[PDB]
């Protein structure tokens, strides 16, 4: 069986309870995770240890909070108390865990399921080939010895319009924003980096990225997390918003792909 779970945010207890609910069995089952494994919840260390231990039985994409953790680990950004990352950062195996984390993909594709996963979704300005190339480019910088330099470069809100002519810092910043921070688009597909509200409570003319027809969403199902205020509702057919706010007191959601059956674990906070 194939299980997809939204943002875990250090909610180790809930993640394990949900996986026991569906009797998740590595070697028979595969787990997809939308990213943002760490921060805010209490058990980022346990979560990272477990997800890494799953090996090929898990397909992860990196989210914004995962990249922020890597920035903190590398001395690029300051640790925020509210993220509750200190046990993980102080762990004797922190090097092993984070060197594994930074090597994980930004994008997962299963052609037989016609299923695409990324943390924030797929911008309507990307076709599939472009999404693949951009994921590969950023993954190449994250997997390199020089990854702290990219992490430092990644911060910024412009450019917010994709073009194949984008080069350098702006290209990497846009790619990172599209994969890990995207929510709302302008009608022409341009990213808005500021509004984080639910679609109905958003100011015009902003629309959800998935409300603009894109070449990928026309051919593939897309699963994503990130957008907690969405509450996993309000999406079109073929779009799966899995982040239901576990660390914020909501729920952890798990979708079984074969029958599109949902399983929910209440938050413990
Ligand atoms: N059920 C909910 N209903 C409505 N609002 C909700 C709900 N749950 C959480 N919120 C809020 O939704 C905001 C941004 O969504 P989020 O929490 O997912 O965080 P984020 O990933 O956008 O963080 P990031 O972009 O890196 O921060 P920044 O750009 O530097 O600024 C957060 O304040 C959080 O109170
Ligand atoms: Mn999140």
Swiss-Prot record:
One of its GO terms (biological process) is response to X-ray. It is an enzyme of class 3 (hydrolase). One of its GO terms (cellular component) is cytoplasm. One of its GO terms (molecular function) is hydrolase activity. CDD domains: MPP_ApaH (cd07422). The gene is apaH. Its EC number is 3.6.1.41. Hydrolyzes diadenosine 5',5'''-P1,P4-tetraphosphate to yield ADP. InterPro entries: ApaH, Calcineurin-like_PHP_ApaH, Metallo-depent_PP-like. This is Bis(5'-nucleosyl)-tetraphosphatase [symmetrical]. Keywords: Hydrolase. Coiled coil: none annotated. It comes from Escherichia coli (strain K12). NCBIfam families: apaH, PRK00166.1.
């Amino acid at each position: 069986a194939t299980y997809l779970i939204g943002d875990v945010h250090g909610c180790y207890d809930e993640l394990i309870a949900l996986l026991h609910k569906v009797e998740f069995t590595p070697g028979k089952d595969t787990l997809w995770l939308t990213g943002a494994l760490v921060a805010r919840g209490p058990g980022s260390l346990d979560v990272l240890r477990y997800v890494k231990s799953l090996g090929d039985s898990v397909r992860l994409v990196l989210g914004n909070h995962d990249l922020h953790l890597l920035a903190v680990f590398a001395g690029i950004s300051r640790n925020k108390p509210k993220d509750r990352l200190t046990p993980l950062l102080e762990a004797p195996d922190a090097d092993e865990l984070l060197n594994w984390l930074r090597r994980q993909p930004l994008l997962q594709i299963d052609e037989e399921k016609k299923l695409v996963m990324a943390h924030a979704g797929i911008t309507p300005q990307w076709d599939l080939q472009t999404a693949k190339e951009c994921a590969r480019d950023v993954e190449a910088v994250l997997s390199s010895d020089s990854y702290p330099f990219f992490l430092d470069a990644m911060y910024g809100d412009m450019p917010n319009n994709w073009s194949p002519e984008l080069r350098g810092l702006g290209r990497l910043r846009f790619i990172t924003n599209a994969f890990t921070r995207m929510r709302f688009c302008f009608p022409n597909g341009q990213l808005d980096m500021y509004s984080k509200e639910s679609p109905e409570e958003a100011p015009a003319p902003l629309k959800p990225w998935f409300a603009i027809p894109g070449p990928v969403a026309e051919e593939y199902s897309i699963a994503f997390g990130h957008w907690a205020s969405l509450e996993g509702k309000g999406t079109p057919e073929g779009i799966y918003a899995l982040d239901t706010g576990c660390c914020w007191g909501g729920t952890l959601t798990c979708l079984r792909w074969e029958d599109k059956q949902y399983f929910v674990q209440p938050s413990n906070r």
